[PDB]
Write a protein that binds this ligand. Sequence first.
Ligand SMILES: Nc1ncnc2c1ncn2[C@@H]1O[C@H](COP(=O)(O)OS(=O)(=O)O)[C@@H](O)[C@H]1O
Ligand SMILES: Nc1ncnc2c1ncn2[C@@H]1O[C@H](COP(=O)(O)OS(=O)(=O)O)[C@@H](O)[C@H]1O
Ligand SMILES: [O-][Cl+2]([O-])[O-]
Ligand SMILES: [O-][Cl+2]([O-])[O-]
Ligand SMILES: [Ca+2]
Ligand SMILES: [Ca+2]
Ligand SMILES: [Ca+2]
Ligand SMILES: [Ca+2]
Ligand SMILES: [Ca+2]
Ligand SMILES: [Ca+2]
Ligand SMILES: [Mg+2]
Ligand SMILES: [Mg+2]
Ligand code: NA
Ligand code: NA
Ligand code: NA
Ligand code: NA
Ligand code: NA
Ligand code: NA
Ligand code: NA
Ligand code: NA
Ligand code: NA
Ligand code: NA
Ligand code: NA
Ligand code: NA
Lengths: 510, 510
Amino acid sequence: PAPHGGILQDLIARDALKKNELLSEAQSSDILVWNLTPRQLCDIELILNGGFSPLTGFLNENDYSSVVTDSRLADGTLWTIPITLDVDEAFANQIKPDTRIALFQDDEIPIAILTVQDVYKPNKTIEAEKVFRGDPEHPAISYLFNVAGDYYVGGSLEAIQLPQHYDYPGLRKTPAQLRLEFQSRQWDRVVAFQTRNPMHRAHRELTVRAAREANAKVLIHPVVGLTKPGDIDHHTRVRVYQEIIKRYPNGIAFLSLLPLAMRMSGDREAVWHAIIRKNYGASHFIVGRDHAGPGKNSKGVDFYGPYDAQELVESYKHELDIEVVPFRMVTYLPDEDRYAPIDQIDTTKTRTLNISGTELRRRLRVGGEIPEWFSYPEVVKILRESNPPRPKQGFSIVLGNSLTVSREQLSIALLSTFLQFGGGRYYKIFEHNNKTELLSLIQDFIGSGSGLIIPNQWEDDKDSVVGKQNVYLLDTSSSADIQLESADEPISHIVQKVVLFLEDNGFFVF
Amino acid sequence: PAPHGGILQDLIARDALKKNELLSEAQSSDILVWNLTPRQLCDIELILNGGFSPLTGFLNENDYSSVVTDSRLADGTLWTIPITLDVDEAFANQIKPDTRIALFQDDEIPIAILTVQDVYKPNKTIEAEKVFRGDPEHPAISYLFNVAGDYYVGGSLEAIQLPQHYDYPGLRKTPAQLRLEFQSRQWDRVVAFQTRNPMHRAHRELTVRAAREANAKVLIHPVVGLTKPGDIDHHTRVRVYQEIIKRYPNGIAFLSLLPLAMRMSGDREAVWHAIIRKNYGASHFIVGRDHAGPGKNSKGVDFYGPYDAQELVESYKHELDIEVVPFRMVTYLPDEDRYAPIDQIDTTKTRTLNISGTELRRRLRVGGEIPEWFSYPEVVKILRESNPPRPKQGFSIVLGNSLTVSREQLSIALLSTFLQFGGGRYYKIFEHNNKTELLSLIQDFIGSGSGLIIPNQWEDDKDSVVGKQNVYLLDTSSSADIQLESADEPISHIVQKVVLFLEDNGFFVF
Ligand SMILES: Nc1ncnc2c1ncn2[C@@H]1O[C@H](COP(=O)(O)OS(=O)(=O)O)[C@@H](O)[C@H]1O
Ligand SMILES: Nc1ncnc2c1ncn2[C@@H]1O[C@H](COP(=O)(O)OS(=O)(=O)O)[C@@H](O)[C@H]1O
Ligand SMILES: [O-][Cl+2]([O-])[O-]
Ligand SMILES: [O-][Cl+2]([O-])[O-]
Ligand SMILES: [Ca+2]
Ligand SMILES: [Ca+2]
Ligand SMILES: [Ca+2]
Ligand SMILES: [Ca+2]
Ligand SMILES: [Ca+2]
Ligand SMILES: [Ca+2]
Ligand SMILES: [Mg+2]
Ligand SMILES: [Mg+2]
Ligand code: NA
Ligand code: NA
Ligand code: NA
Ligand code: NA
Ligand code: NA
Ligand code: NA
Ligand code: NA
Ligand code: NA
Ligand code: NA
Ligand code: NA
Ligand code: NA
Ligand code: NA
């Protein structure tokens, strides 16, 4: 289909002969420089390559507010997610309209030149409520208030080069390249499948059914840009996709990585996704249950209805110009060994089965066996390998402030004790001295599977530098993960308490 | 490197705007038509896509004889394999210079328009001796005298479309497409590996070493056009390649199918291969032991020296304009579990190991276990599956002419007898009635694993319609595979003889 807006805005192609000139202006000591934030790098790449056609820069206030209140650009073009360049007051104050800024990656690689159209201070509450539905726990809203700059800079781009990536060089196909890919193959019907999770059996069936319904080839188009916090890293997912792609009949599917930065914005994002895939050459786009939805909030309520995206996408149907293949909860059928849309069964006459991602983590974290029917073995293997069960996980024991015994001796006692268990885990008494350069390493070790014995707490002003993950507090306090009887409880007693606690939580298995 | 001759002769690109017109001329009832032979289809495809740059048609006598006697085109361009359009006297007589011929595929798809330059009658003995070294058993020589036409038609081409392929649509990259592939990846150093056999451990190591030595990315560029008779089919090989490519570090290798029609011409072919790989975008080309060599003749002598190709390629080194990475016999080192070039070991101080393809077929045909060190398991699995051991192979027992017993009853006896063994093999008394439409099916069944009981021989004039493979003659004659005592030997006796013979050759296992 025609790219959204009618013209693929591949600015790398457009500005090619200006490459050298733009590069010189980018490195000239007079120009103002902004180092792109991670999410911005994702966005900037989708704007420069045509993925966000018709966009050609970051939204000015006029287009931005139109998108917030109208799900459309100022000119009426259907567009649901605001793409802006968020900066801080300091930087915002050094720019005026007509100014030209150099956009860098890693304060070293010049990406593009942005020509300023305006500098405004968005009402984050409105954006949060009109675009992401208001819940403070919604991922997009948390980013907007805790990570995003309080100033937006609308303006047009002139491309120097897409953001730098040293991984999967062959796979991050640009809209132009994908289209060429489909052509060399004479693929004129392609149904794209969005995703941010590893694909399991349900999804393989889901995508093949779509392939069959639409009479089209399959495009696994996963996000490797930025997804829901706590998601499986894209490296692991890529390995999973590459593995599962082999279970498709020869020549039916194509894999391409999309450096998109999701907002986990349910229905609106679904619309945005469809526009994006259309630019990339797809003729069909799947929209299953709770598409781009972040699940439930701490209170158990849904951020979006499991089918809000489908309804919204349906309502813009006549102007999306890319056919949407909707799917209802695809689930497992024990008695018949096969999956099927829940909309075409049940009646109690048929018994289903469904292993939610929740419980999926649970078995991964507990070395539990994951059903042959649920996911392919090679896939589960890759997953366990990246997310090991507790007996292979790292952790830390922090000797609480209330601790009266010799921290030096209690430390050694724990070390020598853990050491006798064996099991390949590396242990260390780790003294941080409140130096963030040391604190920031704590999660590295835990990530590496090591067990750390930390003799002292770190000041509360530093608590943010340390990832709470697998970090237990040994103390008399009620807020201690491992509660002691008294601050001066004898070492061997404290030791047994720590060991049995770790054993209870699966870190040790005898 | 620059394509050979300086200009990539991608005629599909060149003649694009003449597509419709050429197509009309091609299907006009007045034009003369030649249906391309299989090898010609391979050649025509490499000529139209630039693979044979600087060629732009089939060699006229002047260029042809220059290649035969000078390893160069008439203008001096280094070129070792003659590419000609061979036809029969009947067709040859209907054409003169300036004439335009339509070249079709399957007497249905028009491929190109050849403008005739000349029609000559090559002296096949000179070509055979100067180009392929003269031995009547050499694959290229045999083709030249038994399959090739006795007339060549020199002339220029105008492309309509590359020959049609329905398998591996994505993988048969053209020189233009490959180059783009390498670019999108920013690959400016690429060492290409030629091959017509499945790749085993030695090869994987051989190619990685070359990647390391040349500081270049790896291009597995296998031939799926036409190779040495009796080779493993390309479908099985492609499955093997796609499987083995996964053993390379992520993003170090790329796979592309080359529809080349080999001549198994040792050293000359190696030169030709290097020229072809250069056109396809490679900066380096591997030339190992006995490259493009057809082994030994029936008398046990070598068609080429194990390193003739290396020497020939070395002598044209300064004008190939593509760097050659030579390799000596790469072999296995038990005691150290690793492979290495034989040129950097031995001295008896080190013990090697080498499973020749010969003996490899042997185990494949005998269900023997193939060493973990020799090849990856997933690969052997694919091979066994395409080339099953005897107990899963088909066969035929032909009731000899000398037979005096009731052929009807002896047939039934063998059928009932084989039926009681079980083992998934399908059996059938097959009456051919000397009808080639039936005879031509004999090998289809054998290929399908079935056992055939044929009550009568076919007339000697038809013997050629039937593939000798797994076809045994039961007769009193000395030339019978299963020799009978007398023409009237009682059935149970003949039956035991046939059963034990088949058991002895592995078709039956109890
Ligand atoms: N069981 C299912 N039934 C229907 N659709 C599904 C199912 N599971 C996943 N999908 C769809 O698969 C696509 C990607 O799934 P996910 O990676 O879990 O999350 S998403 O944030 O990208 O939507 C979405 O269209 C989603 O709705
Ligand atoms: N053991 C080996 N040592 C060195 N080179 C080898 C070895 N085995 C295969 N090769 C090389 O691998 C390439 C392709 O091998 P093959 O498929 O068997 O045959 S060929 O006909 O394409 O040359 C050639 O360059 C060949 O010389
Ligand atoms: O399915 Cl993934 O959440 O593991
Ligand atoms: O290596 Cl092949 O001859 O099987
Ligand atoms: Ca703020
Ligand atoms: Ca719900
Ligand atoms: Ca006390
Ligand atoms: Ca002849
Ligand atoms: Ca020899
Ligand atoms: Ca007798
Ligand atoms: Mg990039
Ligand atoms: Mg073709
Ligand atoms: Na720096
Ligand atoms: Na409000
Ligand atoms: Na439709
Ligand atoms: Na709703
Ligand atoms: Na349209
Ligand atoms: Na417990
Ligand atoms: Na060159
Ligand atoms: Na026909
Ligand atoms: Na070199
Ligand atoms: Na020699
Ligand atoms: Na040169
Ligand atoms: Na024998």
